[PDB]
Design a protein around this ligand. Structure first.
Ligand SMILES: [Zn+2]
Length: 746
């Protein structure tokens, strides 16, 4: 009750002796610094928050097995907001009783990229759960322990334009494939030939390969709204193969569909293209035959361009000299005439049989300091960099951007691009006599004012703006639960929680039994946007294809595989077809006979598709937050260790006090502000914040906010001696109850 003290001792203070206290700082066993950073490399050795030592993209996919299980940093905030928001419901006697939304708190608990896996140094002669940390071992009495977690933070470095609260967002980018560097697929002799991935080809410049060139058939037509950027199937270019839709197969598909409903399993994009020579079937290891005579016969397209208008692609194979030799950091383009740098271009290369991507990071997972991958500075030279960064509130401009700068760039330009693409499928009411460059992003676009941080946010926004005309971005948790809640339902009820959040939109696909013109059917294409993307999901089975309408002159319903002929997920799978939309005349057409029934089938298919559902490895995928935290610390930084744990207070009001032990490097107050950040929606309960800051020399120094009040003083049991940080909470009883376990078990 009222004031705890926390003794902080260096060996050899016995601590047989200190067990009376509830929290202890042993300053003690330090980890030596390797000047001037203190070295993350010892982490797998100390205990720790396990991160095996490894080249960093194979840290991403890592498992982890040296922990004792996972704490979530926000579990306290999760259930404080859980408890704050209970429904009242009147009882049989007229008393209220308060029901937890205990299913939003389940969903909120899973679906949490925070989670970190720690190894504690738990001993069996005392009840104490030790956490090693670079300057001290902190030992919490187990009753207080459940909330404790690291609050590691890499040093913001102003020349790089750092903003490290965006770390999570970075990690989220990588998970949804928008931080990768690319490279076209390549072959060599190992039938003869065989694919060889270019990131690690270990070959000197001046040696030949065969490699797919792969450009957009043409990004950015100069289109006018009476036209549409319809994807005409008949380019008039000499001596290039074009891929054609096969009418007899496509007709059979549509009849199977109008009768038996849409078939995700058995419908296929490759199946409705004429074989000579369709992009989805052709292969190179299986097409350059041995043969018998006279030999070395390359497949009949081996220098020709192959325009593929449905995919807006234009890939051709070739012999090509490589450059730049091998190196460990994509993007260093691995050949003369390579494939594109800019990340929103890669979002457009639907066919992904033709290139490999790995996330653009470089080197050891635990390094105290290493040169950054060049990808950031390479995104930086992009035109439209300065202009899109201004929306981010970055007035100019890092010369060697930290990843989070280019994370911010990437996700903001991405959002602009997805909206400028999608705005075309709604009706527009403006002069069609105004040419404009079509799939250009807007920059001047008006949206405000919760800053973009998640594609789920961009999706909620695609509907909120295109349909609701609510030009406003929702909080990341509100949107992730919006999508989660749409997916959670099937059948008609899924259509009810759409049109609960987007009433005009669902209110206009609820209505499609009317649907006279093609414009009315045209709204179905937005549907894939729920099921197609998120940092933590994998497709139930990639190679299922979901229905879509591409707009050539006549509105064909293609199946697009999710995705994308390369087990990548997602929003590549889908986004690029959407860059085609009908000419205004095709956009009024007044349907025909089969179109209403195809649309009824499409919406009925999405109404209960579960294509997003295939089970993720939660253990692998959510756990990586501390990996990016310390890796990024190596890129700028270095790191600053620190655990925080929350001490519940129970009178007069029920309220949390964060207590925080940490490295001396970043100043206490800013660290306290960041502490308040782990309460995205419950900050109001966090009523005061102690921050003990142990020096590298073992020279600690407290700091505190409201409700708490520290005062340091020596304790001298005979020869043995050490400081006890007293912590008065004047006016607040806080002791004898299961407050913490009540607080969590909400
Ligand atoms: Zn940085």
């Amino acid at each position: 009750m009222d004031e705890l003290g926390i003794p902080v001792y260096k060996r050899g203070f016995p601590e047989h002796l200190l067990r009376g206290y509830e929290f202890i700082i042993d300053v003690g066993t330090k980890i030596e610094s390797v000047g001037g950073r203190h070295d993350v490399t010892k982490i797998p050795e100390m205990n720790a928050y396990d991160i095996k030592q490894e080249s960093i993209r194979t840290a991403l996919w890592y498992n982890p097995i040296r922990n004792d299980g996972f704490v979530l940093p926000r579990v306290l905030d999760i259930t404080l907001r859980g408890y704050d928001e209970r429904r009242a419901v009147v009882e049989s006697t007229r008393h209220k009783s308060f029901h937890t939304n205990d299913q939003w708190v389940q969903w909120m608990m899973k679906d949490s990229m925070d989670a970190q896996p720690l190894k504690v140094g738990l001993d069996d002669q005392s009840r104490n759960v030790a956490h090693s940390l670079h300057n001290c071992v902190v030992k919490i009495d187990s009753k207080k322990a459940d909330t404790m977690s690291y609050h590691v933070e890499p040093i913001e470095d102003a020349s790089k334009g750092c903003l490290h609260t965006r770390t999570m967002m970075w990690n989220h980018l990588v998970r949804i494939e928008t931080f990768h560097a690319a490279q076209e697929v390549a072959y060599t002799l190992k039938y003869i030939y065989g694919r060889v991935n270019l990131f690690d080809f270990v070959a000197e410049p001046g040696i030949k390969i065969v490699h797919w060139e792969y450009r957009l058939n043409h990004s950015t037509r100069e289109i006018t709204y009476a036209q549409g950027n319809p994807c005409d199937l008949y380019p008039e270019d000499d001596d290039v193969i074009v891929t054609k839709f096969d009418d007899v197969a496509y007709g059979q598909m549509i009849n199977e569909m109008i009768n038996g409903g849409w078939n995700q399993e058995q419908f296929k994009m490759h199946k409705i293209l004429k074989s000579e020579g369709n992009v989805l079937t052709i292969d190179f290891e299986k097409d350059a035959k041995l043969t018998t005579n006279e030999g070395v016969t390359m497949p009949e397209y081996f220098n020709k361009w192959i325009i593929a208008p449905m995919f807006n692609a234009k890939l051709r194979i070739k012999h090509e000299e490589i450059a730049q030799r091998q190196s460990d950091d994509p993007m260093v383009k691995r050949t003369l005439s390579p494939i594109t740098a800019d990340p929103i271009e890669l979002q457009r290369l639907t066919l992904a049989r033709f290139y490999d991507i790995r996330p653009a990071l470089r080197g050891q997972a635990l390094s105290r300091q290493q040169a950054q991958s060049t990808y950031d500075e390479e995104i930086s030279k992009r035109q439209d960099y300065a202009e899109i960064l201004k929306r981010r509130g970055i007035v100019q401009i890092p010369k060697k951007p930290c990843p989070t700068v280019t994370a911010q760039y990437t996700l903001e330009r991405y959002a602009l691009f997805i909206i400028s693409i999608l705005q075309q499928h709604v009706v527009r009411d403006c002069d069609e006599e105004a040419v404009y460059e079509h799939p250009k992003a807007d920059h001047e676009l008006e949206i405000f004012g919760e800053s973009i941080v998640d594609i789920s946010q961009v999706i909620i926004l695609a509907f909120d703006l295109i349909f609701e005309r609510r030009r406003r971005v929702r909080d990341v948790y509100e949107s992730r639960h919006i999508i989660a809640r749409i997916r959670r339902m099937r059948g008609k009820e899924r259509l009810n929680v759409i049109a609960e959040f987007f009433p005009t939109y669902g209110g206009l696909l609820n209505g499609l039994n009317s649907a006279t013109v093609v414009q009315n059917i045209m709204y179905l294409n937005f549907l894939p946007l729920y099921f197609l993307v998120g940092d933590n999901m994998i497709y139930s089975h990639r190679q299922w294809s979901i229905p879509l309408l591409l707009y050539t002159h006549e509105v064909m319903v293609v199946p697009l595989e999710v995705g994308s002929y390369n087990d990548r997920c997602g929003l590549i799978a889908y986004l690029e077809y959407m860059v085609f939309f009908p000419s205004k005349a095709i956009r009024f057409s007044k349907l025909n006979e089969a179109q209403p029934k195809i649309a009824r089938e499409m919406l009925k298919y999405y109404a209960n598709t579960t294509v997003y559902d295939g089970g993720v490895n939660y253990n692998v995928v959510t756990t990586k937050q501390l990996l990016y935290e310390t890796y990024l610390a190596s890129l700028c930084g270095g790191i600053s260790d620190g655990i925080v744990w929350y001490l519940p207070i129970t009178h007069p009001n029920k309220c949390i006090v964060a207590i925080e032990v940490s490295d001396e490097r970043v100043p206490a107050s800013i660290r306290a502000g960041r502490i308040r950040l782990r309460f995205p929606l419950s900050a109001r309960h966090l009523k005061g914040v102690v921050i003990i800051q142990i020096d590298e020399e073992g020279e600690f120094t407290v700091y505190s906010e409201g409700i708490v009040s520290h005062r340091v003083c020596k304790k001298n049991l005979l020869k043995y001696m050490c400081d006890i940080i007293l912590l008065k909470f004047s006016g607040h009883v806080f002791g004898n109850d299961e407050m913490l376990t009540k607080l969590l078990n909400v």
